[PDB]
Design a protein around this ligand. Structure first.
Ligand SMILES: O=C(O)CNC(=O)C(=O)O
Ligand code: NI
Lengths: 13, 68, 329
C-alpha cells in the first residue's frame, strides 16, 4: 500500500 | 559568447514559459531552489543574449551542462 | 481486444522507414547536438556504445535473486492491459511455467532495479549518461542518498526511472502508448526478440492518440491503422533501440524474451517532453504511471543552464555547499 511512481504501463481496455 | 543549439534555445524558452505560468499548487518548485522568480528572470535575459548563437559553433561534442 | 493481432503481425502495410541504423561510435553528443535525437535508432551490434550486460544466459530466476524473492513487481495482464502485482518469486514461478500450462498471458515491463545488485551488471549507452537530466541536472547529493530499491514514492529521492528489466513471455503485447513524461527510451534485447510498431509524434498523430485514449476503445482500434505511416520492425537478440520523445509505439513478443532498458529526459527535445506531459494531464493518467518529480526536475534544469553559463546560482546556500563538497571528492 505505499504509493509508487515511475510505473510503465499503457492504459487499460 | 557560448553557442547553444536551436534545439536547446527553443526548449528553454518553452520551459520558462511553462513553469512561470503554472499556479502555485502545480508549480512544484523544489527544495533546492532559492528564488524561482529571480531564476525565471535570469533565464529570460540569458535567452535574449544567446539568441545569436551560431549553429556550427554549437556543435562542440560536449554538453554545456556537465558537473566539474 | 476485438482487432486481430495476427493480421497486424502478418500484413505488409506498416512499411514506413523511420529508423536510422547506426554504429555505436557515431552515437555521440555531437550527433545529439546536430539532430536533436529526433530519429529512432537501431544498433544491430553493441560495438562502440559503452553498454554492459549480465551473463548471456542470465535467467529470470537470476533477476529474482538480485532484486529479492519478496520484491513486489508490477505486472501487466495482456488481455486487459490492466496492472496487477505479485512478488518476484511468484513472477519467476509464472515465467518458468511451461507455455501450455500458463492460464493467462502476463508481462513485466516495469521492474526498476537501481539500488540492487543487478544495477552494476547493466550499463546503458555512454552517451545517454552525458545527456540524461537525472545524471546532469538533479542535485547529486539527493540522487546519491537513495537507498530504496522499489519505486515507493515516499522513499524516492530522484526520478527513479533509469534502469528497468522487462521479462516477456511469447505472445505478450503492449498496446500503443507514449512513455511517461515524453521520455526517450533505450532498449537492449539481451535474449529473445521484439516486434515494434512505430508512429511518429506529428501534431495530427498526437491528436489522434489523445482522442483514442479519451474514447476508451483501445482494444477495438489498432492505432497503427488510423495513421498515414506506421513502421513495423523486428528487434533481434543483441540489438539496441533508442526511441525519441513522443513516439507512439506498441510491442509484441514472439519468443520468451529478456530486455534491459530505461527512460530519460534530455535538453534537446523539451517541447515534445512538455507536450506529452500535458496529454497525460488531460487524459487523467494516475500519478503512479508518470515521471516522478517532473516539474521539480524542470526547475533544476533551468538553474543548471543559468549556473553553467553565467556562474550565477539559484540554489540555496546549503545546496551549493552540498555540491561544492562533491566537487572536491
Ligand atoms: O516490451 C514491451 O512489451 C513494452 N515496452 C515498451 O513499450 C517500452 O519499453 O517502451
Ligand atoms: Ni514504451
Amino acid at each position: 500500500a505505499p504509493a509508487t511512481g515511475g510505473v510503465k504501463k499503457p492504459h487499460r481496455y | 559568447q557560448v553557442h547553444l543549439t536551436h534545439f536547446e534555445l527553443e526548449g528553454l524558452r518553452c520551459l520558462v514559459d511553462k513553469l512561470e505560468s503554472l499556479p502555485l499548487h502545480k508549480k512544484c518548485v523544489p527544495t533546492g531552489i532559492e528564488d524561482e522568480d529571480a531564476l525565471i528572470a535570469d533565464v529570460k535575459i540569458l535567452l535574449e543574449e544567446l539568441a545569436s548563437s551560431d549553429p556550427k559553433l554549437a556543435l562542440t561534442g560536449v554538453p554545456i551542462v556537465q558537473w566539474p | 481486444r476485438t482487432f486481430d493481432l495476427e493480421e497486424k503481425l502478418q500484413t505488409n502495410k506498416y512499411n514506413a522507414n523511420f529508423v536510422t541504423f547506426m554504429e555505436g561510435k557515431d552515437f555521440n553528443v555531437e550527433y545529439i547536438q546536430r539532430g536533436g535525437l529526433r530519429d529512432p535508432l537501431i544498433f544491430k551490434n553493441s560495438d562502440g556504445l559503452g553498454i554492459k550486460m549480465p551473463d548471456p544466459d542470465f535467467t529470470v530466476n537470476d533477476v529474482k535473486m538480485c532484486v529479492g524473492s519478496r520484491r513486489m513487481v508490477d505486472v501487466m495482464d495482456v488481455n486487459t492491459q490492466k496492472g496487477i502485482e505479485m512478488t518476484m518469486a511468484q513472477w519467476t514461478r509464472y515465467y518458468e511455467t511451461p507455455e501450455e500450462e500458463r492460464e493467462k498471458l502476463y508481462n513485466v515491463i516495469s521492474l526498476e532495479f537501481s539500488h540492487t545488485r543487478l544495477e552494476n551488471m547493466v550499463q546503458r549507452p555512454s552517451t545517454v549518461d552525458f545527456i540524461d537530466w537525472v545524471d546532469n541536472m538533479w542535485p547529486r547529493h539527493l540522487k546519491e542518498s537513495q537507498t530504496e530499491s522499489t519505486n515507493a514514492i515516499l522513499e524516492m529521492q530522484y526520478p527513479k526511472v533509469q534502469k528497468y528489466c522487462l521479462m516477456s513471455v511469447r505472445g505478450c503485447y503492449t498496446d500503443f502508448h507514449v512513455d511517461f513524461g515524453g521520455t526517450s527510451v533505450w532498449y537492449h534485447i539481451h535474449q529473445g526478440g521484439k516486434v515494434f510498431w512505430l508512429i511518429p509524434p506529428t501534431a495530427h498523430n498526437l491528436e489522434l492518440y489523445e482522442n483514442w485514449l479519451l474514447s476508451g476503445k483501445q482494444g477495438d482500434i489498432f492505432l497503427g491503422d488510423r495513421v498515414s505511416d506506421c513502421q513495423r520492425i523486428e528487434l533481434k537478440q543483441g540489438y539496441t533501440f533508442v526511441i525519441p520523445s513522443g513516439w507512439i509505439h506498441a510491442v509484441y513478443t514472439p519468443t520468451d524474451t529478456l530486455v534491459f532498458g530505461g527512460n530519460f529526459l534530455h535538453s534537446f527535445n523539451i517541447p515534445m517532453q512538455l507536450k506529452i506531459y500535458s496529454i497525460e494531464d488531460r487524459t487523467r493518467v494516475p500519478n503512479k504511471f508518470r515521471y516522478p518529480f517532473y516539474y521539480e526536475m524542470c526547475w533544476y534544469v533551468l538553474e543548471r543552464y543559468v549556473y553553467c553559463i553565467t556562474n550565477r546560482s539559484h540554489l540555496t546556500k546549503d545546496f551549493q555547499k552540498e555540491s561544492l563538497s562533491m566537487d572536491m571528492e
